[PDB]
Structure 1
Amino acid sequence: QVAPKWYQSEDVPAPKQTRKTARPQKLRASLVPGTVLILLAGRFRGKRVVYLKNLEDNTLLVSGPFKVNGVPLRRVNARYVIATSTKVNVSGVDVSKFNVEYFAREKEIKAERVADQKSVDAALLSEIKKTPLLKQYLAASFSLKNGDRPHLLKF
């Protein structure tokens, strides 16, 4: 067999200096807070939800609202979401306290999270009541019927 030689060093060289400085994410124009979204993947696929805040994790903060849909406050990915043209005035909804660590991983649900869900749902519902059939629209699931062509549909 071919024996190893003294000159076959095992030292691991350091990597070169990388010039990949990350630059902030660009969202689509259709993703404006208060816009109603359709979730395309996950457990809640087909659910219509309300977009509240753009988190720093490059994700979107979204509510059902829970009392309407059963979808709680959670993050979603922009690329797994169809942004419709319907909008809800969310100027009266305080989404300031929600950040990345709010969703940090620590069934039994946190009391603070449930209270925040209720507090957000209050203002969200009070605004939703203004537009007729919006509450009925949210609670219904989206699906593709026979003959719907998404390349022709307006959302």
Structure 2
Amino acid sequence: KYYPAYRENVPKKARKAVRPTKLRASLAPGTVCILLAGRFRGKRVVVLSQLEDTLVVTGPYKVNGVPIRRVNH
């Protein structure tokens, strides 16, 4: 079952490399930020740290009830 049974149009070597996301200078860790979409739209939450593209964000769960969540920048 292993030998290719068809033309096997193997994709050409694509010269695309993964590089780190350049987030905005204003999305530093610790800055208060307003959520725009999702079930928690309109809430204000604190940016703990930046993931590769998203921001690991949370409002103090005793304050606005927004748990440890990810948010797209």
TM, length-normalised to structure 2: 0.87
Q: Counting strand residues as a fraction of each chain, which structure ranks higher?
A: 2
Q: 1:1-155 residue pairs with structure 2 within 5 A?
A: 10-56=6-52, 58-78=53-73
Unaligned stretches of 5+ residues in structure 1: 1-9, 79-155
Name the counterpart of 1:85: none
Unaligned stretches of 5+ residues in structure 2: 1-5
Code of the residue aligned with 2:47 in structure 1: it is: Y
Structure of higher CA gyration radius:
1
Residues 22-71 of structure 1, C-alpha deviations (whole Å, 9 max, x = no match): 11100101011110000000000000000010113x11111111110010
Cα drift, residue 12 of structure 1? 2.6
Cα drift, residue 75 of structure 1? 0.5
TM, length-normalised to structure 1: 0.42
Would you say how many aligned residue pairs link Structure 1 and Structure 2? 68
Code of the residue aligned with 1:71 in structure 2: it is: V
Distance 1:23 1:64 in 2: 29
Distance 1:24 1:34 in 2: 21
Counterpart of 2:63 in 1: which secondary structure? helix
Code of the residue aligned with 1:68 in structure 2: it is: V
User: For the aligned residues, what is the CA RMSD?
Assistant: 0.9
Q: Counting helix residues as a fraction of each chain, which structure ranks higher?
A: 1
